[PDB]
Symmetry: C4
Subunit: 213 residues, 4 copies
């Protein structure tokens, strides 16, 4: 079971970063090849796809901050958390180095970096990650919520992040989605934001939902 969940998360996060960072990097190189809104939509839709494809096998976390929040609030076994982390970072990094080849001569592989003061990007990442984790705890753990629509709801949140936070921080919510492209592009500006921001956001969204449910 653990092996199949690990493979599921490797593949789901690989596809998440491949489509998200691929569309972002091509768009950033030339808006006539992929529009800004088009790359934001693609980032939302790949989360929709992965949730309906493996949400019932691994839970489709694709995101180390999400796995952490689920474990902290007793929705997921702590013993599996390092494995999920190993899987998500592995898939994100593989995706990014595959892109670095197949979208060449584009050499900024859909990184998330801050526009403007870094603290803007800190606060925005926290809030938009909160929104995503808040709805995630509802649709993934509350029988009173509409679980069949989990994919649409979480993808919607990712799309929002991409449209709005994309203009400030690049709209990550996801240390692995950030770190892969950063390595493939050798671009690390503000990297710590994309670790601290999302963890704060996932832990607070979860906490607030756990209070109100």
């Amino acid at each position: 079971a653990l092996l199949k969940r690990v493979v599921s998360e490797v593949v789901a996060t690989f596809l998440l970063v491949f489509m998200t960072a691929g569309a972002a990097g091509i768009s950033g190189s030339d808006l006539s090849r992929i529009s800004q809104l088009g790359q934001s939509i693609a980032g939302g839709l790949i989360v929709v796809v992965m949730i309906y494809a493996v949400g019932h096998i691994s839970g489709a976390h694709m995101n180390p901050a999400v796995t952490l929040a689920f474990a902290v609030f007793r929705h997921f076994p702590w013993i599996q958390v390092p494995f999920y982390w190993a899987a998500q970072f592995t898939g994100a990094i593989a995706a990014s180095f595959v892109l670095k080849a197949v979208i060449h001569p584009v050499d900024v592989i859909g990184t998330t970096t801050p526009v403007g003061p870094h603290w803007h990007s800190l606060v925005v990442e926290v809030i938009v990650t909160f929104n995503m984790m808040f709805v995630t705890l509802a649709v993934a753990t509350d029988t009173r919520a509409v679980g069949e629509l989990a994919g649409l709801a979480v993808g919607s949140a990712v799309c929002i992040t991409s449209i709005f936070a994309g203009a400030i921080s690049g709209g990550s919510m996801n240390p692995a989605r950030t770190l892969g492209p950063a390595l493939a592009s050798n671009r690390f500006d503000g990297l710590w934001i994309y670790f601290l921001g999302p963890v704060m956001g996932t832990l607070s969204g979860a906490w607030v939902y756990t209070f109100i449910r």
Copy 2:
């Protein structure tokens, strides 16, 4: 119960306004940062997200004119209306001022103000608000409707309003969503429209659905 629902409404209206106004304001300052269509899609999607997040906790009104319409048509208890109201205005205002901090130097924080003669904005806000409350009453209160799709159905209305009414009134339907950004941006052009228009919209959309949901309608 009540306090959880207040917290729900404050968080949901905050996140509604943060995303709606922040995307609309950044877009309004520079369309290469966020496209017009992008800021409208974000507006609809945040309402989808919040309905799937808290519809089963507080009803995810996130809008005082919706709360009012629900109470008037006996779907929501009057005693909690002020609490919901305070939550929504609180969240909206808090969000607008966090935006004012973090989208700086953008200074117009996604306001809704009239394009052209103000009665165009009044008529449009009533009708697009009617649309949103009409479908809301159906999906939230009618067992024959598809309650599981409430978020998608209401968000779709919100998206239409942002696309079409965005070009005339700014597409609010939501007195708190208008007022927060107004205070944060010191822009109040036509502000009364965004109270009267949505109230008339929700009351009338609720009234019409109430008339058609029953073959023999009471009263």
Copy 3:
């Protein structure tokens, strides 16, 4: 009950046309106010909204050609068809003239008129209307289909029609949605296409679905 269904259809069709022709007319006037894709998206979304609002009351036909095809294939009673037709045209025409006042000085109120040779628009209206009626009959009348997703499915078809057929015929599928704006705009080019194409479209789509269904 017929009264409430007629009111349902007047309201739903008014709103379909108000949003669809409103967005199209403002976009046609100035793409910086509403984008081309934006107005297409609004056209699909209002059908989503109306199907979830009144599909369980009147069936959210909103379209005389759809009402007709439902009745021909015995899914809807013939005696209500004229009332549905009256409701639909009435709502469409009223919304169009409401638009004429509130989007002034825009004066083309979101019409659907052909681009290039008229017969292109005829064929395309037939085919895109087939697609919409085909999915409609599955989701509205086949218990093996996903009835809960009917609004999403039918609205999707409407959005495709706006995006693609919008470049050829204006993408109507809907005699009332075309006639309302035509009257409000005083523009009638190719009007007959938007009666005959959609009727052929809905009848043929319903025929083929009726043939393949189990």
Copy 4:
């Protein structure tokens, strides 16, 4: 019952290619007529619509590589594979020539051809087709998946393909949807990629889903 499924696949594949290649071709002639994003959305939405129309009839394959993968992994009878392939190629080519008539004087009919080095298009077609088939096998065959949402999930994969792979290979995943337009355009650049790529993509996607769907996978 086979004739009904064959008619279902002719019609579904015809409408898939009619709307996908029609929008792509008009957009490729003139972005002011249909936007690039718009034609991408049309491509995803027609798959949504066809899955909800005929998923319960024929299974809404509309794609010979999908039929192939379903049959290899014992979800579809081998004996019907040639009938579905015949249906899909007939529907697709017929749609292409109808378009050639009604979008004239546009003469490139929504073709999928490589941008840049052809090997990129091979790799990308494999990966994006893998994504499509992976979710497909979940929602069409796994009782734990949300089958009612199959249309939306598969249409979403198609949309992503059109947006991202559209800038590299044209985003096909579908030998039929490539071949029809190529014949009608007299345009065959890198055609083999749209046979090999999608076949590799659906087989490996179906393989990896088969691997992960069971704790103890038979073999």
